Design a protein around this ligand. Structure first.
Ligand SMILES: [Mg+2]
Ligand SMILES: [Mg+2]
Ligand SMILES: [Mg+2]
Ligand SMILES: [Mg+2]
Ligand SMILES: [Mg+2]
Ligand SMILES: [Mg+2]
Ligand SMILES: [Mg+2]
Ligand SMILES: [Mg+2]
Ligand SMILES: [Mg+2]
Ligand SMILES: [Mg+2]
Ligand SMILES: [Mg+2]
Ligand SMILES: [Mg+2]
Ligand SMILES: [Mg+2]
Ligand SMILES: [Mg+2]
Ligand SMILES: [Mg+2]
Ligand SMILES: [Mg+2]
Ligand SMILES: [Mg+2]
Ligand SMILES: [Mg+2]
Ligand SMILES: [Mg+2]
Ligand SMILES: [Mg+2]
Ligand SMILES: [Mg+2]
Ligand SMILES: [Mg+2]
Ligand SMILES: [Mg+2]
Ligand SMILES: [Mg+2]
Ligand SMILES: [Mn+2]
Ligand SMILES: [Mn+2]
Ligand SMILES: [Mn+2]
Ligand SMILES: [Mn+2]
Ligand SMILES: [Mn+2]
Ligand SMILES: [Mn+2]
Ligand SMILES: [Mn+2]
Ligand SMILES: [Mn+2]
Ligand SMILES: [Mn+2]
Ligand SMILES: [Mn+2]
Ligand SMILES: [Mn+2]
Ligand SMILES: [Mn+2]
Ligand SMILES: [Mn+2]
Ligand SMILES: [Mn+2]
Ligand SMILES: [Mn+2]
Ligand SMILES: [Mn+2]
Ligand SMILES: [Mn+2]
Ligand SMILES: [Mn+2]
Ligand SMILES: [Mn+2]
Ligand SMILES: [Mn+2]
Ligand SMILES: [Mn+2]
Ligand SMILES: [Mn+2]
Ligand SMILES: [Mn+2]
Ligand SMILES: [Mn+2]
Ligand SMILES: [Mn+2]
Ligand SMILES: [Mn+2]
Ligand SMILES: [Mn+2]
Ligand SMILES: [Mn+2]
Ligand SMILES: [Mn+2]
Ligand SMILES: [Mn+2]
Ligand SMILES: [Mn+2]
Ligand SMILES: [Mn+2]
Ligand SMILES: [Mn+2]
Ligand SMILES: [Mn+2]
Ligand SMILES: [Mn+2]
Ligand SMILES: [Mn+2]
Ligand SMILES: [Mn+2]
Ligand SMILES: [Mn+2]
Ligand SMILES: [Mn+2]
Ligand SMILES: [Mn+2]
Lengths: 119, 45, 44, 112
RNA sequence: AUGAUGAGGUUAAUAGGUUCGAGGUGGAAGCAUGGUGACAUGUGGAGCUGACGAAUACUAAUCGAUCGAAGACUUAAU
RNA sequence: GACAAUGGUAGGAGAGCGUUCUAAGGGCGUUGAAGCAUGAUCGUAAGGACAUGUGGAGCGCUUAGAAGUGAGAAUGCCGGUGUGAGUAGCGAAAGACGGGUGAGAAUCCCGUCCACCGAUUGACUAAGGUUUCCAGAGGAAGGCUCGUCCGCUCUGGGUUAGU
RNA sequence: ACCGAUAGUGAACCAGUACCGUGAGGGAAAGGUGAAAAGCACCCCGGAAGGGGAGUGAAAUAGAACCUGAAACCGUGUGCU
RNA sequence: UUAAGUUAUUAAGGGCGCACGGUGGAUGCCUUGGCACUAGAAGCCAAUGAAGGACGUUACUAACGACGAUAUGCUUUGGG
């Protein structure tokens, strides 16, 4: 429960950060945001791992629209990738489908950078 | 409120003894060369 | 707030012009003086 | 003899450069470069480039073995300073000093 | 506030996740039925649930570096 | 040789030091003048020499002459540099990631999502301003941070009326 | 027996100009490489800036923000503490 | 070793001295410009368009001068 901005803006940035990285398996961010986002993402992955329309309509409540370009032709949806792609990978896996990697400080403000990636 | 008397070179330096920066905790990359910050990533190799 | 000096080309040239100086004895005295100092601008 | 190099009028304030400089002073050239690369202050890359150039012409000029080299001495001196202002309340302006500094590094072997 | 104190650092439950639970809310969606409907009942103390409680190494506390004794002299007593 | 006197503000009296110039005499100087620096030197004081370093072309001494002739204080004037201090501040506001570029990206370009104004943060134009407009380069300084970017810099262009 | 760059003109420098005011008007700062540009070819670190060699020069510990280079002020080393 | 007593080393940092640097531009030396006078010339220019400017002129041209559309000059007499 860490913050940064205001309570709603925090929500927005969290849905944005969560939808991203589903979109692309890994992203670069502040260590603080990484530690916040990891929860929201593993949770979306359990909604995906349930499979029911209930938990789908439920994942929809947080996750952003996006578009996603599948390899070669055709277009998915971040939702569709949550349920129809990522969840397939993680069925046998218990909890914790996420890791934070410690990049160290960036130039502009010296904030500590980290990579956050899937398996 | 203002200082009522100027600080001497001596006072000002005594006030500065704790104003260093610590040398970063660091460690050698195993078989990669350039050293990195502790409990931090080994980079692209 | 409304500061003093709202520029106006016409009003600036009336009142403060070469011609406006010339129009009276004193304005000629002014141009005389500025010519004596040798202002690169003179009246403008 | 035991080689040196200098960078002049870098636009960082001398107080600031000196902080990074204290960590490096008296250290082996390799770990000096390490501490330099990891210390995340603004003067670190500048000081780094200076130490690099110093070891460089410590080899190409005086032909020392680079690995035995030590940071015999490092410091920064006040340079000329650019002077600017900063408008304030009630219409007063007030001074600002964009200070600059001469950084110096000198590497070494044994006495002769 | 920062430091500091304290709980831990794989011979590991320190946090996060996961599966449970307390407590909070009060009967989810989907379907079915009853209505012309607005709605109602059933499925079903349902669903959801931050900080609280357990269990579980699935994610992360990796590798590593720094500091830290060899014990002065005199006099009296074994 | 004895003997006497010698605290001192306003203030009176006296004798001197040093600075610039001038006159006359007499000298020093690239085998290194003035100046600057350092020193354990000398005289009762102001002050005077000597050695070493620096410096690179001028300068003392004696007698006299004349003065823009001596600084610590004027909330004195100008300039430099401190202290406060790595302190106050960085000027109303939602941003995130992916991909570029680059010596270097929180800050530049492209992209998706999100957000804010919408009798206006939109679209025109008068006043005023006078190349800030466009393109390609650039990054010292300006930009309250960064900068590969810019109302900044360089080079080259751009305003077409019988109604 | 006038000044010698805070002096002497406000102005030794493209001064009644930067700049300031609606205007009348007010009104600066800023001189010195060297005998000669001989103004550092070339190698090296750097994007550059800047620097170390190598050279020009009597000298660049005269290198352009360039004669001499005081003090305040800022630093690095240490003998006694 | 036990008891009683006595001393020291440590310098995070500071002080005095010294050495080597940086900033800054005093000081010395220098003078292109000033300052006060001396002797003599000279004491007016203008509608035949002045004083003072504006805009232009050069291979390249921003600025100062010079010059004007015959423009960074034209003819002419003399000097060189
Ligand atoms: Mg005048
Ligand atoms: Mg029905
Ligand atoms: Mg119940
Ligand atoms: Mg060790
Ligand atoms: Mg004793
Ligand atoms: Mg004398
Ligand atoms: Mg002598
Ligand atoms: Mg000599
Ligand atoms: Mg002396
Ligand atoms: Mg006399
Ligand atoms: Mg005074
Ligand atoms: Mg602080
Ligand atoms: Mg312009
Ligand atoms: Mg432009
Ligand atoms: Mg006289
Ligand atoms: Mg007025
Ligand atoms: Mg290179
Ligand atoms: Mg190169
Ligand atoms: Mg040389
Ligand atoms: Mg040289
Ligand atoms: Mg004892
Ligand atoms: Mg001890
Ligand atoms: Mg120390
Ligand atoms: Mg006459
Ligand atoms: Mn809201
Ligand atoms: Mn940067
Ligand atoms: Mn200190
Ligand atoms: Mn004037
Ligand atoms: Mn104002
Ligand atoms: Mn502890
Ligand atoms: Mn266990
Ligand atoms: Mn309950
Ligand atoms: Mn270890
Ligand atoms: Mn007396
Ligand atoms: Mn007496
Ligand atoms: Mn008297
Ligand atoms: Mn000689
Ligand atoms: Mn003299
Ligand atoms: Mn002499
Ligand atoms: Mn006087
Ligand atoms: Mn004074
Ligand atoms: Mn002052
Ligand atoms: Mn304070
Ligand atoms: Mn504070
Ligand atoms: Mn603050
Ligand atoms: Mn702002
Ligand atoms: Mn690239
Ligand atoms: Mn964008
Ligand atoms: Mn809105
Ligand atoms: Mn207009
Ligand atoms: Mn303007
Ligand atoms: Mn533009
Ligand atoms: Mn900037
Ligand atoms: Mn003057
Ligand atoms: Mn001078
Ligand atoms: Mn010359
Ligand atoms: Mn160069
Ligand atoms: Mn030579
Ligand atoms: Mn200077
Ligand atoms: Mn000099
Ligand atoms: Mn006369
Ligand atoms: Mn007439
Ligand atoms: Mn004329
Ligand atoms: Mn002829």
């Amino acid at each position: 429960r860490k913050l940064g901005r205001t309570s709603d803006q925090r929500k927005a940035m969290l849905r944005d950060l969560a939808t991203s990285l589903i979109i692309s398996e890994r992203i670069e961010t502040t260590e603080a945001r990484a530690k916040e986002v990891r929860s929201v993402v593993e949770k979306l992955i359990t909604l995906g791992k349930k499979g029911d329309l209930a938990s789908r309509r439920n994942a929809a409540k947080t996750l952003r629209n996006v578009e996603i370009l599948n390899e070669d032709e055709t277009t998915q949806t971040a939702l569709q990738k949550l349920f129809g792609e990522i969840a397939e990978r993680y069925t046998e896996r218990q909890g914790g489908y996420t890791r934070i990697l410690k990049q160290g400080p960036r130039r502009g403000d010296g904030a500590e950078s980290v990579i956050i990636e899937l398996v | 409120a203002v200082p009522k008397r100027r600080t001497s070179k001596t006072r000002k330096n005594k006030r500065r003894t704790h104003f260093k920066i610590s040398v970063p905790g660091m460690t050698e990359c195993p078989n990669c060369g350039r050293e990195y910050k502790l409990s931090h990533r080994v980079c692209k190799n | 707030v409304k500061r003093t000096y709202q520029p106006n080309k016409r009003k600036h040239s009336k009142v403060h012009g070469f011609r406006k100086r010339m129009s009276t004895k004193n304005g000629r005295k002014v141009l005389a003086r500025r010519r004596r100092k040798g202002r690169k601008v003179l009246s403008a | 003899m035991e080689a040196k190099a200098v960078a002049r009028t870098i636009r960082i304030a001398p107080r600031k450069v000196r902080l990074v400089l204290d960590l490096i002073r008296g250290k082996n050239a390799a770990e000096a470069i390490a501490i330099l690369k990891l210390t995340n202050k603004a003067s670190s890359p500048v000081i780094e480039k200076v130490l690099m150039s110093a070891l460089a012409n410590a080899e190409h000029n005086y032909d020392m073995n680079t690995d035995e080299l030590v940071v015999k001495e490092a410091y920064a001196n006040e340079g000329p300073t650019l002077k600017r202002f900063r408008p304030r309340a009630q219409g007063r302006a007030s001074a600002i000093n964009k200070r600059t500094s001469h950084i110096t590094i000198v590497v070494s072997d044994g006495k002769e």
